[PDB]
Amino acid sequence: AKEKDTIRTEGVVTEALPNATFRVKLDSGPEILAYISGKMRMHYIRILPGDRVVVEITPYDPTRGRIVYRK
């Protein structure tokens, strides 16, 4: 089925954490745990604090996200 409820909202990176997990403050409002894309990791695209990435968000829990796009 792939539930396409996936919330494609932008956020500027507040903070860096390990394993490429990042508190990113959103255009939407909150700062929530959002970890990297696999794609980005593969491509070695270094997320650094102060960047407008696209944090994909689950409707089950927005408090965790997933970074999609390169800054």
Partner: protein, 168 residues
Amino acid sequence: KEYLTNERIRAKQVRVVGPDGKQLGIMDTREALRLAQEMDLDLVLVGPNADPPVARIMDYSKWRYEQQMAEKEARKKAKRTEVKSIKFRVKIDEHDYQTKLGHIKRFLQEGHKVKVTIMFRGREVAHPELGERILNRVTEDLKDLAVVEMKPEMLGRDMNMLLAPVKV
């Protein structure tokens, strides 16, 4: 400081200067040496730049020792605290920051000027702001102990600030 003495002298006629700052006249090198011997002291060709290139009786060795003693005091106080450098980084976490701050405080107490420096990599966008966030805060914390002499200043791949202490 390092002068030319008794048997180093080839200046034929020296405008002789006695033990204390005397003016006897223009004596031959040999004559000057003889005079020195008479007092037992050391005749010092202090200047070949002068008028009849000049040699001056003194206890050269002793004088030098004295100078060194005096100079030692000066030389010890010549360095007398320089620059301690600390390299922060754009990310910086809290305990580390605290540690750094403590170090800086210690340095200030000791008496040294402090290069509060940041090394950078890529991503120059948030860079200066981030630096400010650290550095200015740090300065504020040590406002009781330190004075800003250099502000957020660029070196290209870096950034640098300076904190001399408050009281000399």
